[PDB]
Amino acid sequence: DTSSPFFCGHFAETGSFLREGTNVALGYSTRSLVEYRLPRLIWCDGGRLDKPGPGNLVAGFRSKYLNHMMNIWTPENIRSSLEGIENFTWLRFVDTSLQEAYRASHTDVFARAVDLASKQNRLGHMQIVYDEPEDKKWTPVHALFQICERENPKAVAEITTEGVLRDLMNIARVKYRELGLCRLEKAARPRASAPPIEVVCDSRSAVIERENIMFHPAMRKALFGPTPSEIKEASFGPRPVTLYPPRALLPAPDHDKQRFTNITVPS
């Protein structure tokens, strides 16, 4: 006897079994019964303070002259204030650049995490290699102020012969695994699920904005991984090339039998 939690949304019921015989196509028809009906003046034309259409004549000027001209993170407005007591004095010594800071001060928390996902750490390795009394604790001058990046006991701990400190830094995972909290059957589950509420606005621009925000294929690509065609064109080439999801940035689910769903199978 299989089961699942209750579903609050509005799917599409199949008509009959004797019609769609072999070659059928599933459609993502999940919509919320809770709706929110907006006109095409507020949701599309000139009600949003971000959409730069006619009538909303401010949103182009305000976008340009607050994100690219009068901005204290554009590289021209950093290059004039980097020479002394001034405000971007410290930027030479943190392991960044002007383009690094300009990309870090405009993207999301998400896209900045994807940019962190393809940066090989090296200041932990300095403590492994450059570890002599004669070597006077060498740090690169363009990475000088990253002190806590440099002296880290974890980097030395991951190298030692006996793992007497690697059995202390992640003992939470060992205690969580040895209690059997991954093989234990999930006792509780939510009693109702629902898709997120969408706007019933009857323009094509609303459907374009919904399928570019609610789905937003850049985050889906950065979350699930690369296409196998991309893996073929990156692994049969003559030279090594990089990938924008360098690995599948989906986190490993901490429950082995039931991952990311609520569906229950009897046993």
Added chain:
Amino acid sequence: GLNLIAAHSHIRGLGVDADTLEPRPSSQGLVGQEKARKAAAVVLEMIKQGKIAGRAVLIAGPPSTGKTAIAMGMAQSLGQDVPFTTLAASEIFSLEMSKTEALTQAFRKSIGVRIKEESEIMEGEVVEIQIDRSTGGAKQGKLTIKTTDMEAIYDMGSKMIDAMTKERVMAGDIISIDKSSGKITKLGRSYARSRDYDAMGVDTKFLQCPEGELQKRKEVVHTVSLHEIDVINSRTQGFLALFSGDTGEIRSEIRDQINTKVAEWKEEGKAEIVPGVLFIDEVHMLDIECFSYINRALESDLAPIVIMASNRGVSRIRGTDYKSPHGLPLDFLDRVVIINTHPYTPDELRQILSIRAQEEEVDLTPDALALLTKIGQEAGLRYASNLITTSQLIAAKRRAKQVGVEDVQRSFKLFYDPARSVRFVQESEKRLIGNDGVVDF
């Protein structure tokens, strides 16, 4: 189904005349109160005018004298046109945000913008669908539909065939292809293809074919408040906030720009502003930090009319320590205009109990109604209005038809009125925990 009989499910409007403003004594539920209902009629007729600011009318009066009744009458005598917003004054003290801003959102929720624009829709039973997916894809296809009058064939784009296999439109569905967007809301199933449906329940509703033409334009009228637009223009996809309360401190420049664009929409004739009603129930539960903002939110052009109800006499103001009439400061009592109510005469008590008896459909003998009026003279309306619901059930215990004196005298015997409860507390001091002592026999 979600129309369970509450304590105000018998009020179907304010009940007054709309031609000479005379409070006729028994109509639409509100029975007995005359002067307060005429003043509420004057306030109601200056709400629908629109040519006045956000003013403040204070429904002051004793407990259980029909103040929430007058407010619910004004709520029912407007329909779903002018936005009425209830506000019990303890929804303001939140933790997701501050307190003055939680009050400002409740002011912005009651100023609607009403705009009317057209759509083009299609009714009709689908006769058949053919889709040329042959390895092929969603490229071309034919749709033959009909009403009772029309019948037509359409060819479909790729981003419509991808909407036809999305909703799985069968041969016999009653669909509504909104032409400007492309969504498909299946209104039901046609009866004439009842044989053609196998993967349905045994009990399944079936409609008829739509009557009239197949391609028509609707003049839908939407009305959304300024708080709606404020929460929409606050995040990336922020309207979910007004369904989950996760909105925070909204910056004031967004509210200023939306107050500018609503005026620019009004002057171009694209919009229309509807001032609503805000009912601050139990207004004495606000501290002076609230009144020092309501004193200035009732000044702008965009302010709804505030109706509010106070029970307390000379009482203390929260936040401070000094007493004042009605629990309100005097610099704020200069703003408000007060309607005083009165206690109820016994014949009005009898016919209010008669209306509350006819609402729940409980039969009463006149002797039991006389006894119930005699109880309501000494214990208030709420106790007798609960004795009705108790006495019907006690008559249903012993399989009777009409309630009588032998059941009202049991409901009065088991369930104490609060006067005898105060006497029970005063005569059972040593075991009930007053402040310090517990004595056990």
Added chain:
Amino acid sequence: HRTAAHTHIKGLGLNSSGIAEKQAAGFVGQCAAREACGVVVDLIKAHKMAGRGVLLAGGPGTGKTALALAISQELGTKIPFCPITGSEIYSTEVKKTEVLMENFRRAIGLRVRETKDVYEGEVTEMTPEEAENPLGGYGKTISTLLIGLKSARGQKKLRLDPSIYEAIQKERVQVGDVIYIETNTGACKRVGRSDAYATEFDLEAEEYVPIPKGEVHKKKEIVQDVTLHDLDVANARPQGGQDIISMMGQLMKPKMTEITDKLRMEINKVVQKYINQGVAELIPGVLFIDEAHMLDIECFTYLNKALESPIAPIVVLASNRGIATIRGADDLKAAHGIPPDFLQRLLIIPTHPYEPDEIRRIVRIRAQTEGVQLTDAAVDRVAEHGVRISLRYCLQLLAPASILARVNGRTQVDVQDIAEAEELFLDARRSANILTSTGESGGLHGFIS
């Protein structure tokens, strides 16, 4: 199998004519409270209720919550009953009126039929089919599949969206894994390797299940018991579907949020749409607020508007206070801690103290409930302690007095065991007497005053 404080209570013990017969189904005496509780129970089971106030007065140790468990065992299993306290609603994430409304909509139930549309198959050929992808930064994107499901009677070769492919992809479905695609959300739980690929020389510890018999496109109806607060939480924080809001919203930590008025009205209209289709059945319930005097005045203000709703469960308040001061404003005193304006809604049920024979009957019932048999002189001794000291003190002198009896090789409890357990284990009154007498001065052998 653990005897709690309320185990002998099995109901009110009422006759056919609604008259309480004393010493029946757990209770002893207490006529005028149990008849009124029977009236409340039949008020619940008649559905003409949209918010009624029932107060249970009476001093501590007189059985206010024994009546509450009697009501909760008289209504049944399939009627919602939410017991809370007055200190439980003071939270740190939301305002306390949100916790009140969440309890009010925990106390309303709904019984809904659902038709799930499973695709229960064994994956035969899994091959992605990407689409055109010009220069836009993210690169290629898989847009179409050709997954072939193979049940026992008639296979099928179906085509998928990108989102249902991502639902597959976050489940790690290889070739051979049986699945059932749930075409309500889009979710698809892998069950295991099919038994046509079975091999005892294996290491992954997979669960081998046979091929699912029947048609690959099944359709099954179930019955579900969902409260309105479950629908509020479902539409508030979305955790269903295969988009990004409903996927990045189940990796974050869950927070209680403030479900506003508009969602609580729209879900009411959705439930009314369910009822008008002849599918769902509404079953209202009880909110039992024990210790209602701990609620401050900002909660009794909001209970007025919470009870003026056209759909609102019946409230049963318990308050063991006399003339006391309300927690919110410390300058108006009233009976029970209830404010004098909110008190008029309530149908106040009193509760009277006991008698020196009713204590004997309660001691006998409690002794034959826990499993401690004893003699009549010992019953008279425990009833003497019940008259002198307290009611729920003399019940607690039965659990050591069994054990000490098992110390002395006995089976039944005699006078000596209770005469020793009254000396080992003390009450509050004699402890306060020892406190006042011995604790004369603060110092080394004194008490911190």
Added chain:
Amino acid sequence: HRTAAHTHIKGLGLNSSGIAEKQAAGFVGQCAAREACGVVVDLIKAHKMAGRGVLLAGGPGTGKTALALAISQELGTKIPFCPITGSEIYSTEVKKTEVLMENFRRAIGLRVRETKDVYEGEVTEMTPEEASTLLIGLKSARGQKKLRLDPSIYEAIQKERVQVGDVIYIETNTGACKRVGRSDAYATEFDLEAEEYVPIPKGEVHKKKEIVQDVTLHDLDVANARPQGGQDIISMMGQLMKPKMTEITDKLRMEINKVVQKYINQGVAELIPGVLFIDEAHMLDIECFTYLNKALESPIAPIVVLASNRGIATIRGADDLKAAHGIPPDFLQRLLIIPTHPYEPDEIRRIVRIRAQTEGVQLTDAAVDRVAEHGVRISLRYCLQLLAPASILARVNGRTQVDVQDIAEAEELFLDARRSANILTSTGESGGLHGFIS
């Protein structure tokens, strides 16, 4: 045109020599306060101000905020005016010495002139030239026109779904694009496509218009601190990732002053110093009159008009000192204090006439005396709130103008606070079942 409590306030009503004249521009009397507020308006326009404080005395019922709205309509739409009450300074996300600086940075204005070159029209071709630059022909109903695009604005066109013949709206300067719809010449290509079929615009293709437009410095602070609006798509979660107000440090403001002075030295923008009107300043506690005494000494601070109606009251947050106006004498010496005296009985009738001809409610001279009687004997805010209900009692009973009888009915239908207090005390005598609960 809907009536507020200050609809009839148009301006201060002064002479050319800065002397107030009675019954001018909506005011009645109140000479010295209007002369002092005229001097304040001239000080704001003179641009020799880096933090000045102006307090307005006088009890409730007198015209304190009418002077402030007179100043706000005397300056015009150009110079920014930020009215905030005291109670708005409290939040649950930031400290209350930061909402003051947010109001100071909302007060200062920065005016930029732009010449937006908009391009409405139907796409004729999408031709990639180099292998990069992609020409677009924008066909109007007056003629098509070639257009060479940057290789970064084309990646903003391409994110939008523009294929063959979609009408578009290209901003030339700011590079902002919107797809309006599919043109109606390509309407019936297929028969049930789903687009918004709009006609080709019957104007120019190249419309050149200029716009003067303001930016407050607080919007610069927020737009330079956190990413706002455009690419902030992770804010749809809501819990921790929403645009929560954050503690804008002094270093960020100290750099934004450098950047704005750079763009003022190029002659691009203009600077206009604004007005912060803090109303009911007793709600400001002593942990903010300490911070104002520092923050007004900046060389960038705007003028602050404080309003306070109290006498010798207790300063909030420190219960063991009394002071005039609820203002600490550490701070009260900074302020220029302007008195606001009460109203004579011959100066209430003119307020009744002006408030009556603002709402359109016309009435006889035998009723103006009765409204002035209620204005003298009770209050001024109450007598002005019987002109609007009595008109509702005028057109219902078959009349047009308001007589004595409608106001004699409205004084019984609409009781004030004083007679309600007398009914609350004397008539509501016993506290029982049918009594008030004190």
